[PDB]
Symmetry: C6
Subunit: 210 residues, 6 copies
């Protein structure tokens, strides 16, 4: 990643074995559960495009998703080129060439070039631009691999309300509220929840159906 | 987090894989036991709002609690806006815009903005303000998920007093003393504890009923 | 903790996930065995009162002991107030208010205040004062939870002397020597140990009864 | 590796036990799966030729592949010598001798010499040149050890399309697309995929055959 | 420990959780095998007397050995006092009082005092003096707990010579050579070893009896 | 080890618990397999003679090999003394005494003396000299403990050629090529390998016999 030292300047640091192993392990254990995306974002803190490609390419398996990810990345890279066509001309001594979409995705740009953009004044945050592309594609994978629709999350006749709400928002998070939660509750709790009236908090709702 | 380097200035550091994994693991193992809250507070030492949201969002499951947490956060964010309405106007070069509740919760503010508030002179500690909101909501979850009331913690007729006191204050901690501990003791120990008289320490009480 | 950087000034550092997990694990595995106290003292090296409270509060369970600990802490805090009554008056710019017992215990003092005392010139070591209070209370727990008295540690008729001495000083350490070790030895070894005479070292004693 | 300190100069750092163990473990667990190559590249970030040889030589077993790797390395070293024949002459005080292929492979060059090239101005990146040689040879091993050809990856009559695409691109990655993926689909899905028409994305294709 | 920073001055660092756990674990696994002593010495690199006492006191169990260790430490502390009787007098501003044996053992000296001696110019290395006392006592424990004498290490009639030599020097190391190794070899190998003649290396000896 | 800080000067650092444990573990798991030697060399990066002796002495067991190692070390130390007889005389203020073989092996030299040689200008790299002695002796152990000769590595009549080549070069590495690999192949593959002709690469050979 590009990180500030203990003297105040942004320089490059090698991606750590702990970071590499942590990303691989969470994919092995959680696949594309929704909470994997913020883990990817945190573990790729300050990452260059090279670091982002490293993390994606160390994933063995799930290659259908990884190739969907590449298609989304190329879609965003082409949009970036439509909005930022580069102007031919010699690069001045204190400057960096404008990046193309494939430069931001780390496929046609060098590490020194990525360091140059990210540490520029003002910086061109090609790592953060690329990461937003990756997260966009990762979220589309989470939705597509989401097995259950929110319409099929219904409280059992003897299921504790807390467990039902857990499943409800787990499903809703992957699918990407308060009235549907009432409608899919069981007859006994739905009766209690209507007596509460509109505008009840989740805490009030869960308290009433305990 | 925002941490001081080894040269005396507050700068941003990436949240560590050890920190990320430690928060996830303690939630997996302890759910919302009371001792999880001080662990969350220590592991989020110096955290930005972005780091706090990272930690909450890496939690998979327990989504009923996580959504109750969001409702509490929004309640505190709205109160903050009622007490700190921002004044429209251009931000001077050496300054930071006042934050709104959603800025402190990290949803409408950038990392550079959070760094700017937290490292300001004087600093606006949006991380500590947000963390207090989160801990407020986490504590309400601990109470709601507390299974046993203190009234139902009674010493068994052959239960060692030490084990009973353990259960007593474990329950009391989650529910959020000395006379109730005597009343719920078994007949043999309660007889000993009355002979001790008022003002006995816990050590004296546990010594007498051994 | 408050630690010196690599440039010679005392500044605050966040308590590490390794430190937090190490304290929790040793309590889970060893409870209140005597050797847990020096582990607590080493892992709380340079700790602020906030760090000390963090470590105690991350302990789930053993709540009878943790509440005995609080009673001891309050006893020492009240003694400190009896010996150091603070003088009302405005705090000068380069100075820190005197701390009260509850300030040293980290309950009525801020982290900035604890940093201010500990890094003062001369420093007010509120962390070391608090830690001595905690260790005082922890040692009283070790004695109370010590199951066996030294009077009941007697060498078996076929028990190797080395194993008996192990149990002897394990028990003696928790209860908080040379002649009692001889008296509780078995007839065969006690006969050998009297022939050795007075002033024998433990090494000489264990050598003679092998 | 050669890394920048926290003061801005490139100096040598010892390869870490975490790095050494991480490379050994991934080879033990994954052998020469395709995703092992980017792991090797990341864990050898900033590596000298000495560090690269260290990592290769710590691999026990797979000695057929390791010897194929040496043959590829020697092939690239001989090509380098054909393109860069060194000119005999005394090395000036502020300078470094040109490297030969075996110097870049770390067999005829010292660590101080590798440090000198890599930290030169301009730098001769003998580590990155060597690493590209190693990765070239590693990729030829991945292809040769690839067990299944892409022609034999066909969707089962009841196999979910997602699982088939996973196997398809796992195989394709090791062998080193859209129309072959359709042709090898089962009759039911292939019928759906032709109705979609040309130019369908992978996401559209996987959505249609669900 | 007392360690040099990255700016060239000796300052105090807190003993690490990794160090604390590593010492505890090796004692749990290896007790007082001979190789435990160099592990203790390495893990106590740069340790203060306080750090050395921390490591010894975190050992639970083996209390017979730990008390023998204290007796040896007191013996060396008394010898030190016999050789270095301190001269009464006021300590000048830039100076440190001479240490007594109990000061070096960390029982009557503060951490600041130990830092003062160890970082003095010239330094009084109370940590290294104490460590030599500890290692002296630890080695006497290794010998006393050594179960087998070298006289009882004899090669079996079908035991491979390599395995016999392993046991031979394992035993000899704990007891604290070439002709005894020949005499205790089996008849077949002893016959071969006499034909070799005097002055044979261990490698020659093991080669001949294979 | 002796390492450069983040300010450009060579100073001493304590050998890490991770380094100590990594060396012990690899010996426990791999004994004296050939790949253990480069692991020892990497984990002893920048090591002093004291660090090298620490690593060797923390090895429990394999004492036949460790004593063969000492004999080799003494042989190299005596050769060093034959080539570098030291000249008696007072050491000037800015200088270091010449080292003897036992000084380089860390048995008659202090750590400060080893630091002085290794950080001298020009440096006397007693650590690297000693390490070469150790590796020399370690390699002789690998050969002696190598169980199988290369002459006995022959491909089975149904053994895959890849597996046979693996065993071939595993054995050859420990014993310390292309025509012997053909001669020991099975009749079917040897027939294919002769038709290939001379000068075939290992990749071509393994491809032809698949
Ligand atoms: Cl995976
Ligand atoms: Cl790849
Ligand atoms: Cl931009
Ligand atoms: Cl509930
Ligand atoms: Cl969870
Ligand atoms: Cl999220
Ligand atoms: Cl404020
Ligand atoms: Cl009790
Ligand atoms: Cl516990
Ligand atoms: Cl708490
Ligand atoms: Cl004070
Ligand atoms: Cl004994
Ligand atoms: Cl392997
Ligand atoms: Cl090798
Ligand atoms: Cl070049
Ligand atoms: Cl799908
Ligand atoms: Cl133990
Ligand atoms: Cl103790
Ligand atoms: Cl001295
Ligand atoms: Cl042998
Ligand atoms: Cl071993
Ligand atoms: Cl030793
Ligand atoms: Cl030399
Ligand atoms: Cl093959």
């Amino acid at each position: 990643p590009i990180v500030q030292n203990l003297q105040g300047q942004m320089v490059h640091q090698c991606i750590s074995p702990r970071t590499l192993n942590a990303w691989v392990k969470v994919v092995e254990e959680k696949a594309f559960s929704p909470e994997v995306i913020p883990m990817f974002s945190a573990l790729s803190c300050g990452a260059t495009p090279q670091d982002l490609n490293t993390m994606l390419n160390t994933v063995g398996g799930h290659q259908a998703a990884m190739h969907m990810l590449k298609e989304t990345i190329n879609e965003e890279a082409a949009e970036w080129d439509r909005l930022h066509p580069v102007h031919a001309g010699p690069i001045a001594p204190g400057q960096m060439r404008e990046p193309r979409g494939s430069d931001i995705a780390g496929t046609t740009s060098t590490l020194q070039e990525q360091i140059g953009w990210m540490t520029h004044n003002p910086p061109i945050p090609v790592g953060e631009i690329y990461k937003r592309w990756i997260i966009l594609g990762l979220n589309k994978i989470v939705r597509m691999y989401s097995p259950t629709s929110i319409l099929d999350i219904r409280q059992g006749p003897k299921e504790p309300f807390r467990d039902y709400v857990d499943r409800f928002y787990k499903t809703l998070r992957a699918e990407q509220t308060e009235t549907l939660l009432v409608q899919n509750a069981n007859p006994d709790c739905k009766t209690i929840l209507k007596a509460l009236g509109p505008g009840a908090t989740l805490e009030e709702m869960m308290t009433a159906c305990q």
